[PDB]
């Protein structure tokens, strides 16, 4: 532990003999100098650093898997990883592991570009001011990828559970009256009649004499599994039975992807078991900063939670009563200035509670009444991959606290090996309005909605003509891994919490139901939830 400085020329023979000779590692002058400095700092007389260099090279070969380790980041990375492995074994560090290094939140622009190779692969893809703009091919494939993922789910689940297969639409032409089962995106043609779209082609369907599954919501834009008899005389598929593709468990996707490491998995499991007491507090929907009664209720809730600040405090969409827009007036209506003053008032009313907002991360989710997402949509269902709240309105709010995150509306969290998806949207109203009837209580409706959402494998299985989506940022909405915890914030749906297919779904509902500031609480270690209704 004696600090000292050792020069690169003397360590060069031994360093070479170890890294290059022993395992084939290229060493540069800068990396050699930095490693000599590190060795001198963590050992004196520079004799028994051979184990240290061996640990460095073995970790580098096991994780990095390249050459030329002397780049100041391979060296630093391996050094730090050695630090955490020494820490978990309980040198340079002998402390304990912290969940902050294993807790993170992912925005729509920070996800991993997972494009599924149609034959068999789920590849990874990962430049200027206008560098984020999606390309035309992305608009082409935003539904190609959804089709391919749902097809993988079908050919992994249905055939092994139920084994007559899927016939491509293109291959339905010459067959006269045979029985067929199609996995196709239900839609209405430009002619105004119902049909199914598929990469092989599209087929118009005789929706009459069809019996669907009653535990699902069916809308234009969701992909279904129809079955029936084709007719070449009218070139129409007389469908008799239809259902949504069956869902799959999260571990079923994890074993396919094969993405975790073993030591990382053990550390995450150890932290999950040890961190038994961690509280997540979810606020309701429509936290209107303009409504004075809402600030009264929010002050009461903030005081109550200042007694025991939770681990996380998520803030949901539509922070103001009126949708924002370019407001023309000579007064302070000026919805930008009004929204900034609303955040300033929130900061003033929120800085009053020092125990709160400390040792607690608060995340803000945009909604239908938020800047840069509502200023053009005018309170309508605009772009689904909503960008984070602009920092131009968050000067005072962020200045008050130390851990404030403004995240995407369909954001992802990697707090542990589990993934938590936050999503604020009134999906129930859209589903009820757009549900097509069939010529052939509340908990049942919520079950149908959740089953549709999970079986479709998409956050919004809707046509882009019904809800626009950023073409490149579509994997952010796909439920490919089926992560366990769904923060399905909604305002037109009753508050509930249900589990299915190894996935947990919570709808805290609107912040104010009748007279109470409803908010929600969750314990990940027990994976147990509880409502919190507080009277005004």
């Amino acid at each position: 532990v004696l600090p000292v400085k050792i020069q690169p020329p003397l360590l060069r023979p031994l360093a070479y003999r170890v890294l290059s000779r022993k395992y084939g590692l290229s060493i540069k002058s800068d990396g050699l100098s930095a490693l000599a400095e590190f060795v001198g700092t963590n050992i004196g007389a520079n004799w028994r650093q051979g184990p240290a260099t061996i640990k460095f090279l073995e970790q580098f070969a096991a994780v990095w898997k390249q050459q030329e380790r002397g780049l100041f980041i391979d060296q630093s990375g391996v050094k730090e990883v050695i630090q955490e492995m020494k820490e978990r074994e309980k040198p340079e560090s002998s402390k304990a592991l912290d969940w902050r290094d294993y807790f993170k939140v992912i925005n729509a622009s920070q996800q991993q570009r997972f494009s599924y190779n149609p034959h068999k692969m789920q590849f990874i893809f990962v430049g200027g001011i206008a560098g984020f703009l999606p390309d035309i091919e992305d608009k082409v494939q935003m539904f190609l990828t959804r089709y391919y993922l749902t097809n993988d789910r079908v050919m992994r689940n249905e055939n092994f559970q139920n084994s007559m297969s899927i016939t491509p639409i293109k291959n339905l032409l010459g067959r006269d009256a045979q029985n067929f089962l199609l996995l196709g995106l239900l839609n209405k043609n430009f002619k105004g009649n119902w049909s199914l779209e598929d990469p092989s082609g599209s087929v118009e369907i005789d929706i009459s004499q069809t019996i669907p599954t009653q535990g699902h919501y069916y809308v234009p834009g969701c992909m279904v599994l129809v079955e029936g008899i084709y007719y070449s005389v009218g070139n129409k598929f007389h469908v008799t039975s239809m259902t949504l593709p069956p869902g799959e468990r999260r571990e079923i996707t994890l074993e396919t992807i094969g993405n975790l490491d073993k030591d990382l998995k053990i550390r995450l499991h150890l932290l999950e078991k040890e961190l038994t007491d961690h509280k997540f507090v979810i606020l309701g929907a429509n936290l209107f900063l303009d409504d004075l009664k809402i600030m009264t209720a929010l002050s009461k809730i903030l005081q109550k939670l200042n007694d025991d600040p939770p681990t996380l405090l998520i803030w949901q969409g539509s922070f103001t009563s009126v949708p924002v827009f370019a407001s023309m007036s000579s007064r302070n209506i000026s919805s930008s200035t009004q929204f900034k003053n609303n955040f300033d008032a929130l900061a003033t009313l929120l800085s009053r509670f020092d125990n709160l907002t400390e040792n607690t991360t608060m995340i803000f989710i945009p909604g239908p009444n938020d800047l840069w997402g509502s200023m053009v949509s005018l309170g309508a269902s605009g772009t689904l991959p909503q960008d984070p709240i602009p920092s131009a309105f968050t000067k005072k709010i962020n200045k008050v606290c130390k851990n404030v995150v403004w995240s995407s509306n369909p954001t992802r969290i990697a707090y542990l090996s589990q993934e938590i998806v936050i999503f604020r949207d009134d999906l129930s109203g859209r589903f009820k309005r757009h549900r097509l009837e069939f010529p052939f209580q509340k908990v049942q409706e919520t079950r149908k909605l959740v089953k549709t959402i999970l079986d479709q494998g998409h956050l919004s299985p809707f046509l882009d003509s019904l809800r626009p989506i950023s073409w490149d940022l579509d994997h952010t909405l796909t439920l490919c891994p089926i992560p366990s915890t769904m923060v399905l914030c909604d305002t037109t749906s009753a508050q509930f919490d249900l589990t299915y297919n190894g996935c947990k779904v919570i709808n805290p509902g609107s912040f104010i139901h009748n007279r109470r500031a409803r908010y929600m609480e969750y314990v990940p270690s027990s994976k147990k939830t509880i409502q919190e209704e507080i009277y005004i």
Binding site: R12, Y16, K22, S26, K28, S29, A61, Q67
Partner: protein, 200 residues
């Protein structure tokens, strides 16, 4: 009959064998033919179900030893042949992966999409095993070193890919592109293997 899937698989295996046999192109393995594997696995499962069916039907029914023995024996031989075809294909892939690992341990650690998860884990652990063997007792010699005799000690080389400056055992090498060294062949073997120096 029943071995057609295995026959096609072993034909593809020999095709890959001639593919890698030509020169030393060091091509990656052809993509794992999970399709044929799953097809022959389904065939084997159906034949096993047929064996169980014949056994139970002989137990409940009155079947002489002749047909019950003969059909069961034929199906067992069918599994023997199909398993042998699968074993030959997997053994070929394993040995070619061993070749890649042995030659490229000092060269590079790489498109893995052509390999199944079992094969990928096998390669990952086999590199560890090779390193363990190199560092166990025979560490003085380099077990992954060149298999050509060291005919000459001092050779001249030209830098293909500029790598800036790299510290050698005693001095340092300034790998300026389009520059020629004349140094010992001993301490530049790994760099030539990686593809930085070209001349002999």
């Amino acid at each position: 009959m029943y071995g057609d899937l295995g026959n096609k698989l072993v034909l593809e295996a020999k095709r890959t064998k001639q593919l890698y046999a030509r020169s030393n192109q060091d091509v990656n393995l052809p993509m794992y033919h999970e399709d044929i594997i799953r097809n022959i696995l389904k065939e084997v499962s159906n034949l096993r179900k047929n064996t169980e069916y014949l056994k139970e039907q002989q137990q409940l029914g009155m079947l002489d030893d002749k047909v019950a023995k003969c059909q069961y024996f034929v199906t067992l031989l069918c599994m023997e042949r199909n398993k042998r075809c699968l074993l030959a294909y997997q053994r070929l892939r394993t040995d070619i992966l061993d070749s890649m690992a042995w030659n490229n341990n000092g060269l590079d650690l790489m498109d893995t999409n052509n390999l199944s998860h079992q094969e990928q884990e096998y390669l990952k652990e086999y590199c560890d095993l090779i390193t363990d063997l190199k560092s166990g007792d025979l560490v003085d010699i380099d077990l992954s070193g060149s298999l050509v005799p060291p005919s000459d000690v001092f050779i001249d080389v030209r830098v293909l890919k500029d790598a800036g400056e790299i510290q050698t055992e005693y001095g340092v090498f300034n790998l300026i592109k389009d520059s020629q060294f004349f140094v010992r062949q001993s301490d530049v073997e790994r760099l030539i293997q990686q593809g930085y120096l070209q001349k002999i």
